[PDB]
Backbone:
């Protein structure tokens, strides 16, 4: 089927970065995969194929012109309703093309996200990681003598005086990164991509709802109609003027695909809503440990104002990207320090796991 | 067929870690693959296809008339049972969709396992594995200068009297490891994932039994039924009012798929029960060698209280991954000492195979 | 279908260079993919296939006779129009062939570009980047003490008039690149390839429009036609001389294909127009920082005369490749300095991020 | 076809070890592949498909009537044999399903082998090879002073006695192995796995013979039968009471499948018998070179007791792996010493063959 | 198609050794692929498919009566020849099965070759290539000072007398390898594999000719045959006793398959005959250059006795491997010396092209 190749054409599956959320991956996955799956179910071997429309021809007729008549109406689905209001049945014919259209409209926002923000993002995260890769062997290297000063000095002279002068000495400061982050907060050109990506999906879901409301739900329990043939050069013939008892064959598939289309998108709407609201608030679930590391305190320090900035997005992506191989280390081990007190344990643990 | 794609789309097959037990692999593969293979066998080349419904119309009707007659009942399958009680045979129509739904529902728990437990569990293992493997560095060298003191000594003095102070020093102390293991002993945030994984499977099996009992097994030996067409625009016609002897064609497939479905799950229940019960007890099959190594003994030390703790799942997965490439060593070889005596043999075995 | 193999035969996807602009990528993608997708949609399982023609044979005719009569007209599509002017319907038979021909004609410019300009342009670009990377090699490395002694002496007469002296110093000049740029600047053997590539595409689009105008849009609302059979050995037979009410089945597919072939190409025209026009002006968006670098100033200084020079396409390809792996660094970071002043910050940032 | 995907799912094809003997491997291929291949032959394009059953209904019955008549007996195959004993020919319906059952039964033992023996057995092999690697480099390290004394020695001290004294000193000793070898010889936990692996195949081929004997071989020359349709709601009708001359179309493929199934397994049985008997005796085809080698002598020294020991399968799996990359050496080159004896000869070759 | 997949299981395409001659590869390819391709052509879409056999039933018969008549004779191919001698026509039905049998029978010999001689041949070739790699640098480090004394001495002491002694000193010899070659050249265990591999193919070609002669060439031009149905339960019926004018549809496929099968083998046989004859003589077409090199002279020295030896086959595979990457060197450059004379040139050339 056509949906087979299209699956790996759209939803097919640097070198050390994850530039997408798992939630975003799942929502795009389901949004692109649902229409193709329903369409594949609609016209495959699972349901018996054959003639989509059948009509009860008179017994006088032979097979050939009966095939003509019931084939001349499949392309002319238009009900002569006497309940002489003339009604159309085109959605039953146009359903698969509509499904493919929705499938492409689902994939379009992914293309915009890929083209509009990937390179600029890729530069920044890689630069930050390359800078922060070795913040560990700067602390322990120079802050190792704190214990070695402890036994030969007093409480405040070590914890509040010897851990006081080392801070203002060029071994920890990163003024280049400070300048960089200060510049970044002015930028607003990347949050636009994310908000547009979510808003387009919301608009497409609304369009799907209005399409399923205005046109569908009207022919939902109708299985029979009366069509006509004598509307041309066949009007001067001796046969039935209005064909009788024409019944569609694939109503159940229509019902199930409509119901699945409603259900999947209605259950996915909250996921996209939550995706949008994640960026509406500053996040500080673990700042307590971040304010102590020599360079990690910078991101916590610039935690002010409206959360709508590129800093929020880059830190959100980074927090998922702190677990590759080198930040996938001590930074993950700092779970036991969870309850002056940092006098000995906070330094014994740091100097214990050197590498 | 859609089953072919769905096979590798569902059950498709770090870098040194096995986060999946073999029994879990077997149960997940069997449970996900059974409905797919059954539904594929139902509608493939093995059984000749055609019209799943057959009817015996009188010879008066034309071929198209018979086609309309028997094609109008496959989608409207409803028996006029006189034994005028109305009965439906809709499971015969809904079998493949039900099998597909069962296949998806079986894959639901796997996503929860991969999304809620993989990162934390993977992060937890390798650090413990490294702290665990750094053993013969500071254990065979603790003994090389210690075994040489035996001959110039007495029975208790060298290996029964100074051993306790030979193990109480800044060589065996691992406060980081003790604190980490105790902290995860108190925690319970991962065992819930395993419990939910097993409980969802049990609930889904129970729902499968309910569905197979309530709806199925009622129309199981019934293969003929009477239907009617004159329930609409064509009721004003001269023909039979109630159709006679419409017979199901694929009853054998129906019964075989039902029997296979019930049999596979009644076979599968015991192994998942065993998987649930595995975690309820402490593993103490091989602690005799663990309580001797400098780092191994700590694992055996904290075995207290109820067996419902995370430490259990970490140690259980550690047992599976205890033999990768470097731990894939003496661990496997410390199996000859299965029967004071440890004076020479226990130490010559160590000092023989350095590397 | 046939297009399945051709899809990866034509549209299928050094080691560090991008020799293709993303806009050109999407243009080629859509341009070659539209005809294949349309023809795949036209003759696949999405719409019921069979006999594309139906005719109303008299009831006396045999089924073999009717099959012979109707199958004798699809290879002889010639309507006996009385509105005895003879109109033929060859496009309804030849549309797949036309679509495939347009697919090859779309592909021709791609191979033209791949076999006319790739080697020379690739070699030139990789050379240029190779010597251009020496900019950072000199950059600040020789200035390590030149900056370390300036603050010990006075401010504006050790590091404010020695900029020329440092440039005059025999490491900053790049005599090789000057002659190369001049020789390229007079050359015009590369811009002709791009101009012809755009012109050939636009001429082909105009040809598509002419084809869709002259032959199509005439038999566009016509669905019924009359044919004749007695034009040979069948003249001396007793039957109808002119066959009556022959209706083509796939009119909707005809209309859909025509409208799509119009719409996608009308959308495609503006983007190729803009791609053609991108070379009418010089690019001066980030040369402000460039005219400080020791080697990048050579590129900036040679912005003279008519913009139709090979250096235009050279710099166009260069700007995309300026973010590969090594230039994908500080050069991308120098965006903070966007408002004497360059005394410290413009130089503190340089001396901060060495490597 | 279904057999296509199952082929690569079932019989499809560390990093330096061959865990499976060639005989067992080829037996596995033939045993799992014969049913799939013959079943694919049964229902593919090689032989014409269609309606497997044919009946000669009299001309009075219509198209649909005869279709119902000959379609109602394929699922209800029961010959009213007058030679009134009803004989059922259900194997003609249960053939492919029984073949698939046999296919699964064939693949059960291999998963038993791979899940019950591979984990435990994989461990000690690398230990064995690691300590077996030492012997070569130790011999060059040890035996180069030994021959250095030979030229100034008389003869017995390098050829007869002192050499035997010279070897038994702590450079030529492998004490840790000696403890492992005897205890592993005492174990029997692995021979049972091999015995079960072969016994399952023997039992299943015996079951196959019983199935082909009891049920088949009776309906083998029979191709025509008389059935009945008046056994229900069709009893009150005016037509023939018992079907006349219903003939099977696929008797030839039935006979070919039976003959191939019996013949392939009849040829296969002696191979598995020989694979069984391979473990009943010890292999001493090359112990003459082994008994002089540093570590290979120990394997030959422990030649006692019954041939049902784990060391037997251990040495069997090593001999398949003595030719990987390092033992793929002089060991293999020692084929020329096949006929005071090794004056320099042996030593001359070893010292000459550094690596 | 069935033979589609069998192609890639059968004829699908160390790490530096070629264990097959290209002539053997191509003859194996054609021998296994010709029946498969002929089968594919014989039962594919290239011809219109359908019923292989047709009969001219009387017009009184119904459609099912004719279908039963011609479907009851395709599996009962037996001509009631009156030119009442009974003649069969089974080959027209058994052709594909015989073809698949041929495909397997010509496929056994490659398996016999790949399991019988590949390991030992690979061992010998890899040992030889690993050992004989020194000779290049070994010679130059010894023959670098012969030009020192060429000008400072005369003919006897640089060119004809002391060179032999300079050659025969303990930097030249390699006893490990000429001691190796004796048992191999006396061995005859590998020529048997090659001779049986060729003889089997000769036997199978002869058997194919016998099958094509005894059975074919008789049913070659006759196109019509008469069959009968009244030979059982249908004898007591009123219809034709002997069927009239039953015509077979696919005579052309039969003829073309037979002609192609005979022609491909009558052109294939000379290749295998020449391959067999290749080993019947010693090969000496470059030994003028080998007889001078240090280690290559040993191979050219042991050219005695009958050419039926393991040395013949080992050198036959060696010569195909003398151009991999390191013997793909000067050894290939010694072509310019193709015409005392070697006084100066034959050392200048060797000493110049070092690396």
Residues:
């Amino acid at each position: 089927s056509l949906a087979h190749t299209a699956a790996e054409y759209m939803l097919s599956d640097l070198k050390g970065l994850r530039l997408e959320l798992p939630l975003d991956r799942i929502v795009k996955f389901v949004a692109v995969g649902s229409p193709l799956l329903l369409m594949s179910l609609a016209f495959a071997q699972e349901f018996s194929s054959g003639s989509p429309i059948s009509c009860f021809s008179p017994s006088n007729f032979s097979i050939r012109q009966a095939a003509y008549v019931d084939s001349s109406c499949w392309d002319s689905l238009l009900h002569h309703k006497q309940d002489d209001k003339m009604k159309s049945l085109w959605p039953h014919k146009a359903l698969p093309y509509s499904l493919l259209a929705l499938a492409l409209l689902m994939y379009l926002p992914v293309l915009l996200w890929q083209y509009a923000a990937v390179p600029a993002l890729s530069s920044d995260l890689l630069f930050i990681i390359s800078e922060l890769d070795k913040s560990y062997n700067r602390s322990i290297r120079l802050v190792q003598h704190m214990l070695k000063i402890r036994q030969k000095s007093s409480d405040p002279y070590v914890f509040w005086n010897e851990l006081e002068k080392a801070r203002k000495e060029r071994y920890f400061e990163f003024p280049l990164l400070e300048r960089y982050l200060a510049c970044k907060q002015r930028s607003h050109s990347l949050v636009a991509t994310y908000l547009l990506r979510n808003s387009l999906l919301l608009i497409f879901t609304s369009a799907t709802y209005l399409y399923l409301g205005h046109f569908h739900l009207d022919v939902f329990f109708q299985e029979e109609f009366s069509c006509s043939i004598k509307t041309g050069l066949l009007s001067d013939e001796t046969h039935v003027p209005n064909l009788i008892t024409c019944r569609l064959t694939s109503l159940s598939i229509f019902q199930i695909v409509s119901l699945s289309s409603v259900a999947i998108y209605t259950i996915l709407v909250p996921v996209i809503i939550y995706n949008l609201t994640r960026l509406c608030r500053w996040d500080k679930r673990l700042l307590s440990v971040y304010e102590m590391l020599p360079a990690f305190d910078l991101l916590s320090r610039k935690m002010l104002g409206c959360p709508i900035n590129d800093l929020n997005v880059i830190l959100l992506f980074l927090r998922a990207n702190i677990s590759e191989l080198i930040s996938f280390s001590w930074l993950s081990v700092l779970c036991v320090l969870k309850d002056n007190i940092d006098t000995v344990v906070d330094f014994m643990t740091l100097l214990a796991g050197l590498e």
About this structure: The radius of gyration of chain D is 33 Å. Chain D has 16 helices and five strands.
